[PDB]
From Swiss-Prot:
Cross-referenced CDD domains: PLA2c
Name under which the protein is recorded: Basic phospholipase A2 homolog CTs-R6
Keywords annotated in UniProt: Blood coagulation cascade inhibiting toxin, Disulfide bond, Hemostasis impairing toxin, Myotoxin, Secreted, Signal, Toxin
UniProt similarity note: Belongs to the phospholipase A2 family. Group II subfamily. N49 sub-subfamily.
InterPro entries in alphabetical order: PLipase_A2, PLipase_A2_Asp_AS, PLipase_A2_dom, PLipase_A2_dom_sf, PLipase_A2_His_AS
Amino acid sequence: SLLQLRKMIKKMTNKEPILSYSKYGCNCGMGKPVDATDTCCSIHNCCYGKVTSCSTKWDSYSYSWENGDIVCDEKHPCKDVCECDKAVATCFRDNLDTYKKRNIFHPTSSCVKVSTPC
Ligand code: NA
Ligand code: NA
């Protein structure tokens, strides 16, 4: 669920997830990604687009932490959603080096909207 994703983002990045990532660039919370962090969201949106069995927003899944990584429970019916969320939270962590707070106020008109992002 979205509530779990937020927890994953908070632990992966140490940032408050709503302020920091719910509205970032052109893809987070929604065009061509403006940077690496925005690309994480682009990939995440596409990942969610392949989910058929569960509600990406509403359904909860099962996971753990092992040695710095998120491990999705393979037995859970919504494990594909977990994998999407694991990947975006990890991707955010891996791109904090170029994260820019100015991208939270990114004007949608500046986004070059593409036809096939996935
Ligand atoms: Na923060
Ligand atoms: Na754990």
